[PDB]
């Protein structure tokens, strides 16, 4: 709701294509097969 009107200096928009079910596994702090070799979110990931 407040993401419309919250000031952030930069937004890292990372675009790619993966398998369907693995999207929910991309969460701040979540670990898995992709969180160790391809792309891991930071432990303070504030985004979408």
């Amino acid at each position: 709701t407040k993401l419309n009107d919250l000031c952030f200096t930069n937004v890292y928009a990372d675009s790619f294509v993966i398998r369907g079910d693995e999207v929910r596994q991309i969460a701040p702090g979540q670990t898995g097969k992709i969180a160790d070799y391809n792309y891991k979110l930071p432990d303070d990931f504030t985004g979408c």
Partner: antibody
Amino acid sequence: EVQLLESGGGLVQPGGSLRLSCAASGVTVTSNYMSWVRQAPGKGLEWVSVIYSGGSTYYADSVKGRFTISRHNSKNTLYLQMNSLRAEDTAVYYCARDLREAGGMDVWGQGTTVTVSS
Amino acid sequence: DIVMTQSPSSLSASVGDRVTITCQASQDINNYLNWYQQKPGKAPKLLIYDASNLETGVPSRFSGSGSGTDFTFTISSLQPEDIATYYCQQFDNLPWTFGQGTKVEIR
């Protein structure tokens, strides 16, 4: 050279804590995925728990808190403690390393039999 | 969540007979299917990967086919070395529910 051995287990009394040791050489424990699997005598496979790279431990719901995991880099070995083992957990245990999506878990380790019978 | 059960549960044949195994999943799986040989007592051994390429040691009589949810496995000539249980599972979504397992024993 690459070699995977295991230690731990016996005929201790029920409610007696134990510590399995998985000594692997030739690979990197820190940056590899690994799992623990127990197998009943004369039965099929039965997965237990997973450890990822970077300190992330997970299990099944029935074994939610079973393990206390630690590693030693002097010989690149794993130590894994269970407090007050359970009776029907009498089985042969294996520490395994899976290559996942480039050929999955071809060769197995040794596996040690642990009996916690009364 | 996802439970993956083998279409065949208990198949018994003799030496040299064809063996047909269907490996289905709850929904479509891809590149996460392996054909193993555990065998009684001895350590499990993976034999066939990706269902298309033969590995060193596996006889050419074994074949695999399929692109998608269902993968099929064919043994033209059953041999005494094939007394085993085939397990194909979904090692993607924890927890790993167990399948039925195709136990092939020769007569």
